[PDB]
Amino acid sequence: MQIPASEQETLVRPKPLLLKLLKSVGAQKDTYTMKEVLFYLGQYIMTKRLYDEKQQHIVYCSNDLLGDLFGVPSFSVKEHRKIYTMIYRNLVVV
Ligand SMILES: O=C1O[C@](O)(Cc2ccc(Cl)cc2)C(c2c[nH]c3cc(Cl)ccc23)=C1Cc1ccc(Cl)cc1
Structure with missing residues:
Protein backbone atom coordinates (compact mmCIF):
# COMPACT_ATOMS: atom_id res chain seq x y z
CA MET A 1 0.00 0.00 0.00
CA GLN A 2 1.91 2.90 -1.54
CA ILE A 3 -1.08 5.21 -1.95
CA PRO A 4 -3.69 6.30 0.66
CA ALA A 5 -7.09 4.56 0.27
CA SER A 6 -8.93 7.82 -0.11
CA GLU A 7 -6.55 9.04 -2.84
CA GLN A 8 -7.18 5.82 -4.83
CA GLU A 9 -10.94 6.55 -4.72
CA THR A 10 -10.46 10.23 -5.73
CA LEU A 11 -13.09 11.14 -8.30
CA VAL A 12 -11.24 12.53 -11.28
CA ARG A 13 -12.00 14.11 -14.62
CA PRO A 14 -9.44 13.06 -17.25
CA LYS A 15 -8.35 15.77 -19.64
CA PRO A 16 -9.31 15.34 -23.28
CA LEU A 17 -6.32 13.25 -24.45
CA LEU A 18 -6.11 11.01 -21.41
CA LEU A 19 -9.88 10.65 -21.77
CA LYS A 20 -9.43 9.75 -25.42
CA LEU A 21 -6.84 7.11 -24.44
CA LEU A 22 -9.10 5.48 -21.87
CA LYS A 23 -12.06 5.34 -24.24
CA SER A 24 -9.96 3.72 -26.93
CA VAL A 25 -9.69 0.67 -24.63
CA GLY A 26 -13.45 0.77 -23.78
CA ALA A 27 -13.99 3.20 -20.90
CA GLN A 28 -17.52 4.66 -21.08
CA LYS A 29 -17.56 7.53 -18.56
CA ASP A 30 -16.37 11.11 -18.16
CA THR A 31 -15.33 10.70 -14.55
CA TYR A 32 -13.51 7.83 -12.83
CA THR A 33 -11.83 6.84 -9.63
CA MET A 34 -8.05 6.68 -9.75
CA LYS A 35 -8.34 2.86 -9.39
CA GLU A 36 -10.48 2.80 -12.52
CA VAL A 37 -8.06 4.98 -14.48
CA LEU A 38 -5.26 2.54 -13.52
CA PHE A 39 -7.43 -0.34 -14.68
CA TYR A 40 -7.82 1.08 -18.21
CA LEU A 41 -4.13 2.13 -18.38
CA GLY A 42 -3.22 -1.50 -17.62
CA GLN A 43 -5.41 -2.60 -20.50
CA TYR A 44 -3.90 0.00 -22.77
CA ILE A 45 -0.33 -1.01 -21.91
CA MET A 46 -0.93 -4.73 -22.48
CA THR A 47 -2.81 -4.34 -25.80
CA LYS A 48 -0.30 -1.87 -27.22
CA ARG A 49 2.48 -4.31 -26.07
CA LEU A 50 4.46 -1.56 -24.36
CA TYR A 51 6.13 -3.75 -21.69
CA ASP A 52 9.77 -4.48 -22.13
CA GLU A 53 10.32 -8.17 -23.11
CA LYS A 54 13.36 -8.61 -20.86
CA GLN A 55 12.44 -6.30 -17.97
CA GLN A 56 8.72 -6.99 -17.72
CA HIS A 57 8.12 -4.23 -15.06
CA ILE A 58 9.37 -1.50 -17.49
CA VAL A 59 6.96 0.28 -19.84
CA TYR A 60 8.46 1.80 -22.99
CA CYS A 61 6.09 4.53 -24.07
CA SER A 62 8.45 6.60 -26.20
CA ASN A 63 6.57 7.63 -29.43
CA ASP A 64 3.21 6.42 -27.99
CA LEU A 65 0.33 8.62 -26.92
CA LEU A 66 1.04 7.39 -23.39
CA GLY A 67 4.58 8.82 -23.57
CA ASP A 68 3.21 12.14 -24.79
CA LEU A 69 0.77 12.25 -21.84
CA TYR A 88 -2.38 13.95 -12.11
CA ARG A 89 -1.01 16.17 -14.84
CA ASN A 90 -3.60 14.69 -17.13
CA LEU A 91 -6.74 15.33 -15.08
CA VAL A 92 -8.47 17.31 -12.41
CA VAL A 93 -9.79 16.14 -9.03
CA VAL A 94 -13.54 17.07 -8.87
O1 LIG B 1 1.33 -3.29 -11.98
C1 LIG B 1 0.20 -3.54 -12.34
O2 LIG B 1 -0.08 -4.21 -13.60
C2 LIG B 1 -1.49 -4.16 -13.74
O3 LIG B 1 -1.96 -5.48 -13.86
C3 LIG B 1 -1.88 -3.31 -14.95
C4 LIG B 1 -1.35 -1.87 -14.89
C5 LIG B 1 -2.19 -0.81 -14.60
C6 LIG B 1 -1.74 0.51 -14.56
C7 LIG B 1 -0.41 0.76 -14.90
CL1 LIG B 1 0.22 2.43 -14.94
C8 LIG B 1 0.44 -0.29 -15.22
C9 LIG B 1 -0.04 -1.61 -15.22
C10 LIG B 1 -1.96 -3.45 -12.46
C11 LIG B 1 -3.34 -3.04 -12.05
C12 LIG B 1 -3.79 -1.87 -11.44
N1 LIG B 1 -5.13 -1.94 -11.26
C13 LIG B 1 -5.63 -3.11 -11.69
C14 LIG B 1 -6.91 -3.65 -11.71
C15 LIG B 1 -7.10 -4.92 -12.26
CL2 LIG B 1 -8.74 -5.61 -12.26
C16 LIG B 1 -6.05 -5.68 -12.79
C17 LIG B 1 -4.76 -5.17 -12.80
C18 LIG B 1 -4.52 -3.91 -12.25
C19 LIG B 1 -0.90 -3.17 -11.70
C20 LIG B 1 -0.91 -2.53 -10.30
C21 LIG B 1 -0.64 -1.03 -10.26
C22 LIG B 1 -1.08 -0.31 -9.15
C23 LIG B 1 -0.83 1.07 -9.07
C24 LIG B 1 -0.14 1.72 -10.11
CL3 LIG B 1 0.18 3.52 -10.01
C25 LIG B 1 0.26 1.00 -11.23
C26 LIG B 1 0.01 -0.37 -11.31
Missing part, protein backbone atom coordinates in the same frame (compact mmCIF):
# COMPACT_ATOMS: atom_id res chain seq x y z
CA PHE A 70 3.14 11.15 -19.13
CA GLY A 71 6.03 13.25 -20.49
CA VAL A 72 8.57 10.41 -20.39
CA PRO A 73 9.91 7.69 -22.66
CA SER A 74 9.68 4.93 -19.99
CA PHE A 75 8.69 4.04 -16.39
CA SER A 76 8.48 1.22 -13.86
CA VAL A 77 5.09 -0.17 -12.85
CA LYS A 78 6.55 -0.61 -9.33
CA GLU A 79 6.69 3.20 -8.69
CA HIS A 80 3.06 4.11 -7.92
CA ARG A 81 3.62 7.58 -6.50
CA LYS A 82 5.64 8.45 -9.59
CA ILE A 83 2.88 7.12 -11.82
CA TYR A 84 0.22 9.05 -9.87
CA THR A 85 2.22 12.25 -10.31
CA MET A 86 2.29 11.68 -14.06
CA ILE A 87 -1.44 10.85 -14.14
Whole structure:
Protein backbone atom coordinates (compact mmCIF):
# COMPACT_ATOMS: atom_id res chain seq x y z
CA MET A 1 0.00 0.00 0.00
CA GLN A 2 1.91 2.90 -1.54
CA ILE A 3 -1.08 5.21 -1.95
CA PRO A 4 -3.69 6.30 0.66
CA ALA A 5 -7.09 4.56 0.27
CA SER A 6 -8.93 7.82 -0.11
CA GLU A 7 -6.55 9.04 -2.84
CA GLN A 8 -7.18 5.82 -4.83
CA GLU A 9 -10.94 6.55 -4.72
CA THR A 10 -10.46 10.23 -5.73
CA LEU A 11 -13.09 11.14 -8.30
CA VAL A 12 -11.24 12.53 -11.28
CA ARG A 13 -12.00 14.11 -14.62
CA PRO A 14 -9.44 13.06 -17.25
CA LYS A 15 -8.35 15.77 -19.64
CA PRO A 16 -9.31 15.34 -23.28
CA LEU A 17 -6.32 13.25 -24.45
CA LEU A 18 -6.11 11.01 -21.41
CA LEU A 19 -9.88 10.65 -21.77
CA LYS A 20 -9.43 9.75 -25.42
CA LEU A 21 -6.84 7.11 -24.44
CA LEU A 22 -9.10 5.48 -21.87
CA LYS A 23 -12.06 5.34 -24.24
CA SER A 24 -9.96 3.72 -26.93
CA VAL A 25 -9.69 0.67 -24.63
CA GLY A 26 -13.45 0.77 -23.78
CA ALA A 27 -13.99 3.20 -20.90
CA GLN A 28 -17.52 4.66 -21.08
CA LYS A 29 -17.56 7.53 -18.56
CA ASP A 30 -16.37 11.11 -18.16
CA THR A 31 -15.33 10.70 -14.55
CA TYR A 32 -13.51 7.83 -12.83
CA THR A 33 -11.83 6.84 -9.63
CA MET A 34 -8.05 6.68 -9.75
CA LYS A 35 -8.34 2.86 -9.39
CA GLU A 36 -10.48 2.80 -12.52
CA VAL A 37 -8.06 4.98 -14.48
CA LEU A 38 -5.26 2.54 -13.52
CA PHE A 39 -7.43 -0.34 -14.68
CA TYR A 40 -7.82 1.08 -18.21
CA LEU A 41 -4.13 2.13 -18.38
CA GLY A 42 -3.22 -1.50 -17.62
CA GLN A 43 -5.41 -2.60 -20.50
CA TYR A 44 -3.90 0.00 -22.77
CA ILE A 45 -0.33 -1.01 -21.91
CA MET A 46 -0.93 -4.73 -22.48
CA THR A 47 -2.81 -4.34 -25.80
CA LYS A 48 -0.30 -1.87 -27.22
CA ARG A 49 2.48 -4.31 -26.07
CA LEU A 50 4.46 -1.56 -24.36
CA TYR A 51 6.13 -3.75 -21.69
CA ASP A 52 9.77 -4.48 -22.13
CA GLU A 53 10.32 -8.17 -23.11
CA LYS A 54 13.36 -8.61 -20.86
CA GLN A 55 12.44 -6.30 -17.97
CA GLN A 56 8.72 -6.99 -17.72
CA HIS A 57 8.12 -4.23 -15.06
CA ILE A 58 9.37 -1.50 -17.49
CA VAL A 59 6.96 0.28 -19.84
CA TYR A 60 8.46 1.80 -22.99
CA CYS A 61 6.09 4.53 -24.07
CA SER A 62 8.45 6.60 -26.20
CA ASN A 63 6.57 7.63 -29.43
CA ASP A 64 3.21 6.42 -27.99
CA LEU A 65 0.33 8.62 -26.92
CA LEU A 66 1.04 7.39 -23.39
CA GLY A 67 4.58 8.82 -23.57
CA ASP A 68 3.21 12.14 -24.79
CA LEU A 69 0.77 12.25 -21.84
CA PHE A 70 3.14 11.15 -19.13
CA GLY A 71 6.03 13.25 -20.49
CA VAL A 72 8.57 10.41 -20.39
CA PRO A 73 9.91 7.69 -22.66
CA SER A 74 9.68 4.93 -19.99
CA PHE A 75 8.69 4.04 -16.39
CA SER A 76 8.48 1.22 -13.86
CA VAL A 77 5.09 -0.17 -12.85
CA LYS A 78 6.55 -0.61 -9.33
CA GLU A 79 6.69 3.20 -8.69
CA HIS A 80 3.06 4.11 -7.92
CA ARG A 81 3.62 7.58 -6.50
CA LYS A 82 5.64 8.45 -9.59
CA ILE A 83 2.88 7.12 -11.82
CA TYR A 84 0.22 9.05 -9.87
CA THR A 85 2.22 12.25 -10.31
CA MET A 86 2.29 11.68 -14.06
CA ILE A 87 -1.44 10.85 -14.14
CA TYR A 88 -2.38 13.95 -12.11
CA ARG A 89 -1.01 16.17 -14.84
CA ASN A 90 -3.60 14.69 -17.13
CA LEU A 91 -6.74 15.33 -15.08
CA VAL A 92 -8.47 17.31 -12.41
CA VAL A 93 -9.79 16.14 -9.03
CA VAL A 94 -13.54 17.07 -8.87
O1 LIG B 1 1.33 -3.29 -11.98
C1 LIG B 1 0.20 -3.54 -12.34
O2 LIG B 1 -0.08 -4.21 -13.60
C2 LIG B 1 -1.49 -4.16 -13.74
O3 LIG B 1 -1.96 -5.48 -13.86
C3 LIG B 1 -1.88 -3.31 -14.95
C4 LIG B 1 -1.35 -1.87 -14.89
C5 LIG B 1 -2.19 -0.81 -14.60
C6 LIG B 1 -1.74 0.51 -14.56
C7 LIG B 1 -0.41 0.76 -14.90
CL1 LIG B 1 0.22 2.43 -14.94
C8 LIG B 1 0.44 -0.29 -15.22
C9 LIG B 1 -0.04 -1.61 -15.22
C10 LIG B 1 -1.96 -3.45 -12.46
C11 LIG B 1 -3.34 -3.04 -12.05
C12 LIG B 1 -3.79 -1.87 -11.44
N1 LIG B 1 -5.13 -1.94 -11.26
C13 LIG B 1 -5.63 -3.11 -11.69
C14 LIG B 1 -6.91 -3.65 -11.71
C15 LIG B 1 -7.10 -4.92 -12.26
CL2 LIG B 1 -8.74 -5.61 -12.26
C16 LIG B 1 -6.05 -5.68 -12.79
C17 LIG B 1 -4.76 -5.17 -12.80
C18 LIG B 1 -4.52 -3.91 -12.25
C19 LIG B 1 -0.90 -3.17 -11.70
C20 LIG B 1 -0.91 -2.53 -10.30
C21 LIG B 1 -0.64 -1.03 -10.26
C22 LIG B 1 -1.08 -0.31 -9.15
C23 LIG B 1 -0.83 1.07 -9.07
C24 LIG B 1 -0.14 1.72 -10.11
CL3 LIG B 1 0.18 3.52 -10.01
C25 LIG B 1 0.26 1.00 -11.23
C26 LIG B 1 0.01 -0.37 -11.31
